[PDB]
């Protein structure tokens, strides 16, 4: 699957996608790939 190596992808038991980016150190509930 095509995914930039900076995008550390994790999924919450709530059924939510949640990002943790290694460069900016950011946590986003918004997935840019899902749209």
């Amino acid at each position: 699957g095509p995914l930039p190596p900076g995008w550390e992808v994790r999924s919450t038991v709530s059924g939510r996608i949640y990002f943790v980016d290694h460069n900016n150190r950011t946590t986003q509930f918004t997935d840019p790939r899902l749209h």
Partner: peptide, 15 residues
């Protein structure tokens, strides 16, 4: 976002 506060950025998240 409009969602609850996301999980604090831990470098390597194992859940």
């Amino acid at each position: 976002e409009l969602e609850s506060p996301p999980p604090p950025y831990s470098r390597y998240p194992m859940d």
